[PDB]
C-alpha cells in the first residue's frame, strides 16, 4: 500500500513543490578573482552542501520511501549530478548567457575557462537553460522532471520475483508523474497533439542532462586524481559509485 499511487495530479504537484530544497549560497568573495583550485572549491563545496538537502528532498518524493534502502542509495548515486545540473539549469533560465550556481555566484562562459576542460560542459548547461527558456518551462513541470530523473536514471541498472514488484512500482510512480505532466499541459490550453509533443520535448532533454552528467562525472574524477581541490567525503563516495 503506497500513498504515492493514490495522489491526484494536483496533489502530486503540491507534494513535489512543497518538497523543493532551498537555494544555497556559495562562499564566493568578489574581492579577489579565484584560481582554478579555489573556483572549483566553491563549486564542490556548494555541491556537497546541496547533496545533504537533496537526500532529504528525495525522501519526500512520492514513492521513494517505499523503496529499499539499498535501492534508494543506488538511485541517488546514479542521479545526484543530473539532479544538481537540472536545478542549476532551472535557476539560470532568467539569466541568459550565465549559470546561476548560487544567488551570489553568477558565471558566464568566459569565467568558466578558469577551470581546465570546464568550457564544453559550460556551453552544454547554457544550451539546456536556453532550451528551457525557449520552451517557457514551468516550475510545476520542472519538479516533475527532477523526480523523473531520480526514479529513472538508475531503474535499468538493478534477480528475484520480489525485485520485479519494486521495479514495477517505480515504473508505476513514473507513469503517475507522466499523467501529472499531461495534466499540467492540458490545463495550459494545449491540444492533445501539443501535449504529446511538449511531453516528448521535455523527456528528450533528460537525454542531454545524462550526457552532461556523464562528462561532468569524468571531469570530477579528473581533478580528484590531480589532488587539486579538496573533495568532501560524501562527494568522493558519490564519485566512487560511478567509477
Amino acid at each position: 500500500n503506497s500513498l504515492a499511487l493514490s495522489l491526484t495530479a494536483d496533489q502530486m504537484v503540491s507534494a513535489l513543490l512543497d518538497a523543493e530544497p532551498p537555494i544555497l549560497y556559495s562562499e564566493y568573495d568578489p574581492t579577489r578573482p579565484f584560481s582554478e583550485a579555489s573556483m572549483m572549491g566553491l563549486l564542490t563545496n556548494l555541491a556537497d552542501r546541496e547533496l545533504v538537502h537533496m537526500i532529504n528532498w528525495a525522501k519526500r518524493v512520492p514513492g521513494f520511501v517505499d523503496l529499499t534502502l539499498h535501492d534508494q542509495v543506488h538511485l541517488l548515486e546514479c542521479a545526484w549530478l543530473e539532479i544538481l545540473m537540472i536545478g542549476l539549469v532551472w535557476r539560470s533560465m532568467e539569466h541568459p548567457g550565465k549559470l546561476l550556481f548560487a544567488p551570489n555566484l553568477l558565471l558566464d562562459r568566459n569565467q568558466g575557462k578558469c577551470v581546465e576542460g570546464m568550457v564544453e560542459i559550460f556551453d552544454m548547461l547554457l544550451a539546456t537553460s536556453s532550451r528551457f527558456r525557449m520552451m517557457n518551462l514551468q516550475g510545476e513541470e520542472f519538479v516533475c522532471l527532477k523526480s523523473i530523473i531520480l526514479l529513472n536514471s538508475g531503474v535499468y541498472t538493478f534477480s528475484t520475483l520480489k525485485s520485479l514488484e519494486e521495479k514495477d512500482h517505480i515504473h508505476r510512480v513514473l507513469d503517475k508523474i507522466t499523467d501529472t505532466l499531461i495534466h499540467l499541459m492540458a490545463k495550459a490550453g494545449l491540444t492533445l497533439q501539443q501535449q504529446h509533443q511538449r511531453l516528448a520535448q521535455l523527456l528528450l532533454i533528460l537525454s542531454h542532462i545524462r550526457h552532461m552528467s556523464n562528462k561532468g562525472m569524468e571531469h570530477l574524477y579528473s581533478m580528484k586524481c590531480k589532488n587539486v581541490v579538496p573533495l568532501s567525503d560524501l562527494l568522493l563516495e558519490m564519485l566512487d559509485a560511478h567509477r
Binding site: 525522501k59 534502502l69 539499498h70 541517488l76 567525503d233 560524501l234 563516495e237
Partner: peptide
Amino acid sequence: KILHRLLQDS
C-alpha cells in the same frame, strides 16, 4: 556509506 547513513538518518 555516508549516503546510506544520511538516508536512514532520523
